[PDB]
Paper text:
Using its baseplate, JBD30 attaches to Pseudomonas aeruginosa via the bacterial type IV pilus, whose subsequent retraction brings the phage to the bacterial cell surface.
Three tail fibres resembling bent arms protrude laterally from the baseplate. Each of the arms is composed of three heterodimers of gp47 and gp48, which are rotated 180° relative to each other. The folds of gp47 and gp48 are similar. In contrast, gp48 could not be classified into any enzyme family. A loop and three-stranded β-sheets of gp47 form a positively charged surface depression, which binds the negatively charged α-helix of gp48. The gp48 fold is stabilized by a disulfide bond between Cys142 and Cys174. The arrangement of the three heterodimers of proteins gp47 and gp48 is such that they form a unique interface, which can embrace the pilus.
Author numbering:
A (entry chain E), D (entry chain B), F (entry chain F): 2 to 306
B (entry chain C), C (entry chain A), E (entry chain D): 2 to 318
């Protein structure tokens, strides 16, 4: 359910998380020291460990003779971008301070403190359908850093579930939505807003950035109560834009929330009801208005069980 | 707890409202009925219709709360309106009323009034009520007037904030208006404008919420709003997802309406509307009923326009 | 000559309109039926509904006139409209249509288009028609869309001005609009604004009438108007008798609607609307029927507002 | 029906018009060389001939012992003005060039050319009810001139059926409307607009003045057609304002119309249909924009039978 | 139908004009003479010459038309002008004249006035006249004043447009001007500018034509013009073929002058000048006579300049 | 007079039109299956049929030993252009939908519908002198298309009687004018405006293009009357520019006119007087402002007898 560990290199994190998944019944179609093709009852995913980063992609079928980025219905070729790039999570060379892993039969969440105050999330799973009838729903998110030393959360940066970024090559997260607007079932919609593509998706990923496009943003800003110092969980609703520019609410992120960390220290819990919450910062602790050099006070909350 | 009907006139409509509040089988069986602490007709009607004044007490679901509300009927034949005014309070004392004047000043921590616009004629009407909040909707031809008041649901224990009273009406009650008003200020609960929704702060000071700014309104309320329809604060474009929202494969998503205040002193989340949500327009409209998890929801639209951002659903239970 | 009903959708509504125009017992018995000279569907619908185009010929009451009208259905699912466009003309030639493009340019002395706003759903509808003019009204919830076209009644012999064709619609047909539009430009016949009513001059040049001025509109039409609602030209105050008009002891006065042009070159009275009048609002509203001298009149209001100056009655015969 | 004559003094006009009325069955309750109290099935009127003007008043009952301005229900005391003055028509000392008289069982119309180009109307009758159920409807109108030599149609002037005038002493015309807003039946409403009195009446009297309050004014301006030189009759609708400032259309002036005389000479007829029309200027012939020294081109049209 | 002479003064010139119109052998023999319906001298001349006013009626060639024209003489000694004003109309009534003022307002659908500039002295003069149109030219030293009025020749049957009356003069008649005026506005028939040529529309509204634009002129006339000299609308250069036109081997080409209107409502060709054409300047000038097909044509030039685009020929028959 | 037919290839059109000319007395100096040298009392012409186009030239004398483009006084060498090219009419490979031919003793007019909505004119004759004394007057016009798929009436295109074109190699029409400005009698002036050559000619050919140089252009725009839906014929006057930049009107095109086809369908007749008119579009039916992809609404009118 909740595991903690350490890793000097990304390969160690990779080995440990596969060990955990296998111990929990996760089905790995093909495994190696650096490359994974795995699946569950919900979807198929493929991962590869680089020297200092992780490459992730979704999948719809399996072929052992195809490369890690060439599986049937892979997101590389079936996406609106002209660049045709897969999901990237840019890590460091290590050693990593620690890693915190949430494992379930339907989703896998990871938060790695690579260095003092430096954190990277890696998210995989399927959105809670909540009774809505749609095929797909599998989401894969990584973390990207623009340039060290300069504004780290600059406009060109992309983040999990992000609603605003400028980049023509790579995406930080992606969501499956099948048969949208009469197209072929395999459709891997990225989180983009400026490409003006007919079909796309959007989320609260950046939190409370000045130009974040989501109507629940104010809730995150207001997630903290000054009168009683109480904090609440805000569902992470995702939105989809179709051909006629007519949006459709698609769902919420399972067991996940976003909040303001103004009055909380990293890891400080606040039990709301019978369920317990673990809160950690996205990238690093800074001030309220430091949207350039850090991730301000946005905090990711996971339900610990 | 719910009644759909047609009242022959405004006086009969108010009579039916009170009969519903005191004799609905659910209310009496569960012992949730309200108490009329006051009922009077003080003024000497000239070229105007008779004025009814009522003050009722609600005990809440648990029987340990104290809710005080006031209703009024005020009309003028020459201008041809039969407005219904509403207000809320915590205490009442008929002896506190000064000579002449009015009784709504006798309320302790009195709040300004809101209203609904009607006239003397058969009017289709929809009443919803629960021990903590009441909602009124009236179908005037192609227009829908709507108002109500009650307790919101804060995320904190009631022990320290026992009194989260909110009042909402289609237009401010400080002026007399004719229901044929076409101005943008005549609007609904989901989008207050120009003193159309008030909420009582835990400090005991009433704060007004507006989804859009206004010079005539006081500066303090510009900072506090209903975020769902107030997405324009953070977005850098006129057109956003909220105005382009639409159903999903026949499923209509219900979005909760949220109070929020963003002051310089500090931030605070206050709560949600109990039984009110936002819903889209395309392929749908008012009088529609949608069933979610075995619970039905009715649809309504604001008088000014029936566009996407002006269309809200109310839970009927 | 009159039909009240509910059309399952816009296509069925147009079908019912044509069936009324060709098979109403009064029309066939008196030999006043219109002739469909053209019917087609040229475009390849993409993310849009099928487009119907119709061109019909009316002979008039006396059988010696020549009236040509055109109707169109145009819709888009993504924006969710199923608009109905209308135009008038004097001659038609399918061979004159250039490659591609559209057929409405083939009309000799072609006039720009007007429209009515609807969608694909059951809609209550009211059709009126006579050998010289047709009127369409549609009840969209609490809103009423209205349009029509035909000959006005000039005070001069027909021998020199045989062709007094007028066309009126709720909004200009040069742009696509969604019927949830709440702008002040979306209005009715009794008060055209921004290219919502055109009339053909005896010289053969189409002139537009507007009851209120507008910068976006061309300067020439500022001088020509519908006087009844355009009393503001001569009065020195915003509030006038026309907006305060009200019934007299239960009798509702019907006031004729008048075309007038006041140019620098010279003045000319053009005529009246046949079967359209202004009526007040107080104590009344749409769907009302009033009987004068054994002739009934129905009431309707404009989409923007239902105030006194935006409420007109149509003769039902 | 249509009589023409001459008179050196107002007394002669008076004698001739009484002779005509008596010959037509009009009932004169009391007659003298200078004072009249007469009535018909519709109403009661009283007239007195001064040295150079006529004084007119309405009546509701008769008393031979009361003065000309003291009859029961007289307009002098039963009107909203504080001044309490009766109707006045200011004439000249003569000799009068001519007089044109229209006589019927229900109304009496007079147009006197006192001098070359100088005309005075005098109107009495009852509005055509047109099926509207109301008690009263009797109207009496005279003509007032502000000051000779200066702007003759100045703002302070008052005219028959006028909709705009400034004066605190006398009125140029008046209309009966009984039981308005629950008041006593005897009510003689004057044509005034600036007194802000709760109950009053208004008409198209001044024609097309810059500040005339009537929505049909544009019709008079447009009464002439340039394309075919055709002229039409515009009904003279009267309006009433009550306590709640809510207006009520009351009726139209029988056999009377107003038009523009731009392309017509005085007395020039234009037969519209089977009925024949006689058109005459109100005060004098001038130009289009001479609203100060003359009555511009406003022309009164009577149906001749 | 033609007279060349020298009038001792403006009064004698007008006398000779009327004597020509009533006693020319062609006019009387063919029964085409005009009728003087009015002749008067209303004003009391102060430091001014006597004012003559005349109104004449022409029956047309076929004897079934009704043409009404008015002429006036107006002069001032101190400023030393003896202007002659002209106007056209359809009806006349001496009783319609208001007290004082003037009689030209009595005309039904009265048109504004044009004029010609002369003085009290021997002046050479050229009159042309036919039952439908009259032309006047006067040689003032090296300048040539010219004016006239009558029916144009539309390409459509007279049955529906019986009344194509046009009036043209060298300068606008709304102001008093001295014939020594050297401004560019003082010009001729072939090129109206600033209200120097009016034409009656079939709708009954007078429209002004100008070959060049002008801010002081109203916006509406900018769209309607005389195309022949108005080639600048479509050409992308100042110098065009029309200003460089020249005779061909001694043959002088006569080009018809054309009315045209290009409005937003629609287009319409109106007709040609009967007996007026454009001709070049080089190697030629005024007083020249050129014979084409046995029909002679005289030459004339405008007061401002005698350049190529300001030189027109008139048919003498 | 008026013939209609069909042709799968240009050679068929050629054979049929020679058969028609011979049947009407036209004198053909030399004939072949593809090359013609013919003449009448007015002038001499030479035609050659290519695979998909026609080559035309004027002539002043005959020599059977010279090629089709080498006859005495041929326009190729006796023209101001440096390129020295003959007249070209660019057709298609067929099959041609139809062809409409007007034949007379003095001129020959052809309008070929090569495909649905695609029309090509070919004009030969002599201008009506109208009593003007000048030698020559023979005009030969063809049709040129710039590039299919792009703006078909682009600026570089040339058309019969055109007044504005940009091209250095070929011309679309040409007119004889002998002895201009003291030059040798053989002079074949082309329709050009931008070459600034001392001697040239201009016509209304393009109709109502934005940059068409002709003063009668407005007539074509105004050729339609909205009030009565009437259409008139506008003479097609031609202009000539000489050495001193002093123009000379030269004549009009016989039995030919130009008009606006806004309210007319192709082939729709309108009998103006006792003579009957046939109207056809120049290139294709489009809209009012489509001067790029089609020939807008310009219509050529021929008097049918």
């Amino acid at each position: 359910a909740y595991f903690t560990g350490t890793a000097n290199n990304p390969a160690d994190l990779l080995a440990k998380v596969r060990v955990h998944a296998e111990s929990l019944g996760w089905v790995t179609d093909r495994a190696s020291a650096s490359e994974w093709l795995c699946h569950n009852a919900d979807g198929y995913w493929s991962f590869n460990a680089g020297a200092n980063q992780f490459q992730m992609a979704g999948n719809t079928g399996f072929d052992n003779s195809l490369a890690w980025n060439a599986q049937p219905g892979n997101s590389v070729q079936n996406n609106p971008y002209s660049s045709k790039g897969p999901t990237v999570a840019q890590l460091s060379g290590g050693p990593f301070t620690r890693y915190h892993l949430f494992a379930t039969a339907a989703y896998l969440h990871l938060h790695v403190e690579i260095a003092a105050g430096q954190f990277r999330p890696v998210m995989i799973g399927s959105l809670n359908k909540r009774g809505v009838g749609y095929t797909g729903g599998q989401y894969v998110c990584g973390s990207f850093i623009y340039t060290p030393g300069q504004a780290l959360t600059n406009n060109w940066s992309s983040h999990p579930f992000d609603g605003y970024h400028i980049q023509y090559s790579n995406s930080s997260c992606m969501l499956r939505l099948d048969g949208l607007d009469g197209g072929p079932s395999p459709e891997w919609l990225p989180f983009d807003y400026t490409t003006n593509v007919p079909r796309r998706v959007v989320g609260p990923g950046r939190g409370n950035y000045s130009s974040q496009y989501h109507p629940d943003v104010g809730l995150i800003d207001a997630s903290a109560n000054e009168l009683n110092s109480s904090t609440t969980t805000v569902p992470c609703a995702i939105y989809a834009f179709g051909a006629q520019q007519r949006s459709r609410y698609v769902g919420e992120v399972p067991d996940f929330g976003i909040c303001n960390m103004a009055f909380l220290a990293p890891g400080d819990p606040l039990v709301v009801g019978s369920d317990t919450w673990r809160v950690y910062p996205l990238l690093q602790r800074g001030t309220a208005t430091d949207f350039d050099s850090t991730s301000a006070w946005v905090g990711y909350c996971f339900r610990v069980v | 707890a719910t009644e759909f009907g047609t009242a022959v006139n405004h006086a009969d409509l108010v009579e039916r409202l009170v009969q519903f509040l005191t004799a609905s089988p659910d209310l009496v069986a569960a012992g949730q009925a309200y108490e009329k602490v006051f009922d009077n007709t003080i003024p000497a009607s000239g070229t105007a219709i008779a004025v009814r004044q009522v003050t009722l007490r609600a005990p809440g679901l648990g029987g340990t709360d104290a809710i005080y509300m006031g209703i009024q009927s005020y009309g003028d034949t020459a201008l041809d309106y039969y407005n219904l005014r509403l207000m809320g309070g915590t205490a009442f004392n008929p002896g506190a009323i000064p000579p002449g004047g009015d009784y709504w000043t006798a309320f302790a921590n009195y709040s300004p009034r809101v209203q609904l616009l009607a006239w003397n004629q058969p009017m289709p009407y929809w009443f919803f009520a629960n021990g903590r909040r009441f909602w009124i909707v009236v179908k005037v031809s192609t227009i829908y007037e709507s108002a109500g008041a009650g307790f919101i649901l804060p995320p904190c224990p009631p022990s320290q904030y026992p009194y989260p009273l909110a009042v909402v009406g289609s237009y401010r009650g400080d002026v007399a208006t004719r229901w044929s008003d076409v101005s943008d200020r005549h609007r609904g609960i989901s989008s207050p404008y120009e003193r159309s929704c008030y909420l009582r702060d835990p400090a005991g000071r009433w704060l007004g919420f507006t989804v859009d700014g206004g010079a005539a309104n006081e500066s303090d309320y510009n900072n506090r709003t209903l975020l769902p329809l107030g997405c324009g604060r953070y977005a850098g474009s006129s057109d956003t997802v909220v105005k382009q929202l639409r159903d999903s494969f026949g499923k209509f998503p219900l979005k909760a309406l949220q109070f929020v205040t963003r002051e310089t002193e500090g931030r605070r989340y206050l709560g949600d509307f109990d039984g009110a949500f936002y819903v889209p327009t395309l392929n749908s409209g008012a009088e529609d009923v949608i069933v979610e998890d075995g619970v039905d929801h009715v649809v309504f639209q604001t008088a000014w326009r029936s566009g996407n951002p002006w269309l809200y659903a109310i839970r009927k239970d």
